Amino acid sequence: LEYSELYPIQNEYRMMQSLDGMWKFQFDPEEIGKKSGWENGLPAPVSMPVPSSFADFFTDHKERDYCGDFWYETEFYLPAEWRNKKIWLRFGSITHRGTVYCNGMEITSHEGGFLPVLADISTVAKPGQVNQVVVKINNELNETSLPCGATKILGRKLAKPYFDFFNYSGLQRSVWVIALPEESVKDYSVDYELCGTDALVKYEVVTTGEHPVIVRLLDAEGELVAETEGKEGILQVANARLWEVRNAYLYQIVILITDGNGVLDEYREKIGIRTVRIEGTKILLNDRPVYLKGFGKHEDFPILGRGFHWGIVKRDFECLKWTNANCFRTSHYPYAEEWYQFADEEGFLIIDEVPAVGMALTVPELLKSHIADTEEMITRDKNHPSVIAWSLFNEPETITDYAYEYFKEVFAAAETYDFQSRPMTGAFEKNSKPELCKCYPLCDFICLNRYYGWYISGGPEIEEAEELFRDEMDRWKAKELNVPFVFTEFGTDTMAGLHKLPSIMWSEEYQKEYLEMNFRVFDSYEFVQGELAWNFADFQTTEGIMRVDGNHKGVFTRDRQPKAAAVVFKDRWE
Amino acid sequence: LEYSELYPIQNEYRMMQSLDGMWKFQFDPEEIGKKSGWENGLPAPVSMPVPSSFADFFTDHKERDYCGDFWYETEFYLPAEWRNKKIWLRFGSITHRGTVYCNGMEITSHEGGFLPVLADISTVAKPGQVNQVVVKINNELNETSLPCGATKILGRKLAKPYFDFFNYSGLQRSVWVIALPEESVKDYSVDYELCGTDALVKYEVVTTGEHPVIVRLLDAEGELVAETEGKEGILQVANARLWEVRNAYLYQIVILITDGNGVLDEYREKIGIRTVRIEGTKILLNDRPVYLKGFGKHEDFPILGRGFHWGIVKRDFECLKWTNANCFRTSHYPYAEEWYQFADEEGFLIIDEVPAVGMALTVPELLKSHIADTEEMITRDKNHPSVIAWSLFNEPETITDYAYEYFKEVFAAAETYDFQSRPMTGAFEKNSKPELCKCYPLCDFICLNRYYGWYISGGPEIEEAEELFRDEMDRWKAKELNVPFVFTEFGTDTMAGLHKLPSIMWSEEYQKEYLEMNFRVFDSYEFVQGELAWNFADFQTTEGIMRVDGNHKGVFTRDRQPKAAAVVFKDRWE
């Protein structure tokens, strides 16, 4: 990559300053901003919180549903001391695609709305002065970038997703301006081997120069436990304190660039010594089988939309721990980096998912976008101990040799980017029948999204649903694939407060009964090794006749309170 | 009594015709109806369903909240063949007090809104012609009739209850016109003794004449199992099939009046051979201890108010059976007779409660009203096997010698009216402290209404609540009264759909936790022998700042669906 994905830190060599706050903001329905000098400042802005999705602040439909080009602007004072450092704007994300300007100059553009955007403003930055950043953003959906959809023209544009979740957009994550030394740590990778009571931390370091590198490992108390020299090497850890499920331990890696007797740069990050591998039908963490228990989530909260906030992280993890979960999938896009940092702390397992949802010649361009997002996700997230698997798709077509050749390239790219070569998978929709699917052989383990008892034979037909479920799982069993299966979606829309005896679809009681039936099926097959329910919480969707204020398959409400079924998960996962 | 309480039947000697349907109805705010000939027909009526409470039909406040005099009218054709029978209007109830007119003539008046009103129209009835009935009703509340309250004058009147439940009124139960033979069975009483595998049915019969009486007992198949002669006697039943809790068996008693070789009258009613007695701290049904499990209920349903309907009975009993209940209290007034008939069928136990709720010299008049209601209730309900106890008050003052002398008279009257002398009790409010209460010695067993964890030390103080509860029960225990205790109220207001983690007062989760705490306390005392939760279902109350559309202490919603806590009862009572 032409930039670093490394999370920004502050020390003797690296500086950072937050640009979060109220930005200037303006819609550009006529698409004349770049024609009209907007990159030098917006002509008639309103204020817009950053980080946040813009949609749910407004009281009018056309602003909430805005689709097209729209602009952000802010000003920041740059400390004079940042002079002659490499100065970067770092956006947690820009959703979905955008062009960054600084002091009237075009800096960079990015496609993909859920991963960091880095813009090198070294040559245009004005140390000791007020600087200006302007971002042109677009939130349309197409079939050549992720996530896929269409754009309808009423000249007013309307996003038409091929995915369920609401098309939130804007500057949904924190924005920093940072300063790095001229020769810096750009990237590093760690991989682990367990040796009795000891451990090896294998590493590679990429810098922007040719000076020597020293790598140190500190324990949780900051004590030096290992040290070595070189951009490539092994850190030997005696009596290693392994990072364990729901029982984290984090070391601190310290990467130094040196020039004789002085340090040029120093990067530090918390990491966790752990191994993950698929062995037969088992998922092994540190050589012991683990059964995944948890949820698909979303970045979704009232008013903020996908806007990041530590308070949402904290509540969600307390709820997760209360259910006795150990895992979540980042459905259906990489989350803010902070979610992974916290999962590292709390010992949660993550399946990290690229926004390959909603899946013509456009396909070669789509593949490029999909591979680019995969590269960025893996480079960003590989050193989190929590991240134990990559999900490279959600419910694509998989039953043609055409689909096979496409995903072969994606998986091949993912493999080259992940230093750890940790398990890769994808979530299969029901149409990927065991007799037809061509893509499951690409996977280290198989993830199934199934709604037997909701979309199939729901309600009075739920007994039929269970037989149909068992019939499919019997077909999978007969294949003797010798791989683990994880259910990554299953659930029922459930309106909090809707009670019925006997239960009906949409009642709290039916949600319980549906889950109990699914558990019976899960527990009937030895090779099922994980259950991640859909969804952790009710979340916003495109409005329509099938969505009663978003998706109500949450086990929790949108404001994070338990429906009756939450207790069912709690008791089972205990 | 100057009339029969016997449920109307249809046979060769007795006729009945329903007057249910749309009646004429008119409010009388100026109280001029009797001054203006309304007893001969209402001048400007609207239509009003009977049976029903009138309040919730209207769309305007002043009609819903109407307090004062109001009138009903209907017409009915009397079959010519009813000539020279004793012809009666029979109202299931007239709420709260009223005067019955027929064909322009005043027939009778009644005070008490929850028991049958009989009006002898023999002398004014017109067989083979259309007849007219007009009822003047009043629904004000005072301190000389049950249930007690006040009437506020804004000249518009407003009822101000001393009780929680909404002041529903009108013709809330079915109305019949009936014809009886000139000499008829007016009353009868049965009492049971168990003798090994056999049983004795002791009986008394009251007729309006001097002709001989024969009494027969038929089994559930209609087979003759016993026969005897006389207005007083014993029916000997070999291998009696006892009426059991949740396992009913009903015989049919047949009472004949005879004149040589012909029958003058014949009354039949289903009865159940069972005994109830208090022995030490135990409640014995057929000589075996039973622990009461169930609810206080109400006659309360959307739109109909307290209006009787068999559909409400059926749903409620299915819900009751689903919770594994065996008992309910008729809080806070005798219910429609049909509820008891069905309890007989389903083997449910009933505590039958007079409307002595909401408790000056007015007291001597109040006592007369209270005794009259008690006489009517017991005479009406004594032959139901389901009715195993009389509740003669709900939360009165009991800590003065004054209160003691009052209730001594009530209990004495009840004792003279109940042929079976079955257990008598009353529900005590918390203010009836064990050191102060003078009235608990009058009771065969003690009923406590307690809200430790709701009105006392609720929410964050719930641990304190439990200690306070145990402290009071320890005080009761120290008295060594050697009587059973039944909790007849305990519960929390609970809004369906209100979820919180951790729980808050009013959430579904707090209702569960509150119940679990109460159960722990109950189960800590050997002499506690029953738990009747408040309430079976959410019900209508006077509006106010403490009532969010009525009372929400229901375990079921008003439309009879289970909140989370309903399962807690189900699992415990299984």
Automatic annotation (TrEMBL), chains A, B:
Domain of life, per lineage: Bacteria
GO molecular function: beta-glucuronidase activity; carbohydrate binding
One biological process term in Gene Ontology: glucuronoside catabolic process
Residues in the signal sequence: none
Domain Glycoside hydrolase family 2 catalytic: 276-574
UniProt enzyme class: hydrolase
Record-listed beta-D-glucuronate binding positions: D164, H332, N394, E395, Y455, E489, W534, R547, N551, K553
Keyword Hydrolase applies: yes
Listed transmembrane segments: none
Pfam families listed in its UniProt record: Glyco_hydro_2, Glyco_hydro_2_C, Glyco_hydro_2_N
Gene3D superfamilies, per the entry: Galactose-binding domain-like, Glycosidases, Immunoglobulins
InterPro entries linked to this entry: Beta-gal/glucu_dom_sf (IPR036156), Galactose-bd-like_sf (IPR008979), GH (IPR017853), Glyco_hydro_2 (IPR006101), Glyco_hydro_2_cat (IPR006103), Glyco_hydro_2_CS (IPR023230), Glyco_hydro_2_N (IPR006104), Ig-like_fold (IPR013783)
Keywords, in A-Z order: Glycosidase, Hydrolase
EC id: 3.2.1.31
Domain Glycosyl hydrolases family 2 sugar binding: 16-181
Domain Glycoside hydrolase family 2 immunoglobulin-like beta-sandwich: 188-274
Homology family: Belongs to the glycosyl hydrolase 2 family.
NCBIfam families in UniProt: PRK10150.1
The protein's name: Beta-glucuronidase
Organism name: Mediterraneibacter gnavus
Name of the gene encoding the protein in the UniProt record: uidA
